[PDB]
Amino acid sequence: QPIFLNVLEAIEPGVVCAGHDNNQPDSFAALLSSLNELGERQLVHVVKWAKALPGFRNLHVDDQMAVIQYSWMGLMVFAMGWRSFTNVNSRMLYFAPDLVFNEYRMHKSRMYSQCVRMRHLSQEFGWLQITPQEFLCMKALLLFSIIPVDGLKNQKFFDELRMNYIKELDRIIACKRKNPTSCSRRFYQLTKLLDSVQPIARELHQFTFDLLIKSHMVSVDFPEMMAEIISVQVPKILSGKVKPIYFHTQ
Ligand SMILES: Cc1ccc(OCCn2c(SCCOc3ccccc3)nc3ccccc32)cc1
Ligand SMILES: C[C@]12CC[C@H]3[C@@H](CCC4=CC(=O)CC[C@@]43C)[C@@H]1CC[C@@H]2O
Asked: What's the impact of mutating residue 113 to N?
């Protein structure tokens, strides 16, 4: 009996509703103000998920908040890619049961090319045959995939933590196979998939940052925590002070 997977599966967040009035015409301001609200709500869930992760309260308290606040985009995109694959066979974007994106909403949001990228990512889940155990490990692993170039308050704890999640992923892959190249292939595949979440998250950091700057001119609302994170933390990523941790060089 695997204690690590039990935990990952126990703490997985439920459904989060976007609060969207689907009875509105699909306007830009309204799709975007709703996505923002989805962001702010999902944040609360990510925090409590992250805090109930194995080894996590180990990290220094400020590092705990830092790594949540750099990594959120990556996490939410990956999950949403999954929700999309499990429900709507990847065909649309399952932001929340009350906020699914069709083509038309992908154009109206004005972030059409990002949505296409998110859709693709979503499809990889099918193409690779990602099991729910792989999904869960990879997603938790994503929490420790982006950090300040000049390290964290307790970087050693962090590096140990991350190493452990990597080895746990290797475990979920390997406790079921036989032939030799099989487990190499697969691990290569997942490290590549995990890597590819980063340029997408980066496109979306740019996007939302831009939006926030021009939100008064455009009637898009940003909730308190989303405002703050996007103006304090995202800029550290955009300017290159915080950076992802790739497995492979691009
Ligand atoms: C809530 C809780 C309880 C016990 C914990 O023990 C730490 C275990 N741990 C760790 S160790 C974190 C490294 O930092 C430390 C902290 C204290 C002493 C030595 C190293 N990495 C893990 C990866 C997967 C699963 C568990 C992992 C962590 C959180
Ligand atoms: C950041 C953002 C609001 C929050 C969105 C984000 C797109 C990706 C995303 C996926 C989710 O499943 C929840 C909300 C988030 C995190 C949106 C892109 C522009 C908008 O400002």
From this structure: In prostate cancer; somatic mutation
Domain boundaries, the chain: 1-250
List the CATH code of the domain at 1-250.
1.10.565.10
Whole-angstrom Cα distance, residue 172 to residue 167?
Answer: 9
Query: Resolution, in Å, please?
Result: 2.5
Q: Whose CA is nearest to atom 21 of ligand 2?
A: 208
Apex CA 248: angle with CA 125 and CA 93, to 5°?
A: 25
Closest residue by Cα to residue 96 from 113, 108, 109, 79: 79
User: How far is the centre of ligand 1, averaged over its atoms, from the C-alpha of 200 (Å)?
Assistant: 30
160 C-beta closer than 6 A to ligand 1: yes
CB of 90 closer than 8 Å to CB of 125: yes
Give me the numbers of helices (H) and strands (E) for the chain, helices first please. 10, 4
Instruction: DSSP letter for 148, please.
Output: E
Q: Determine whether the shortest distance from the Cβ of 18 to ligand 2 is under 6 A.
A: no
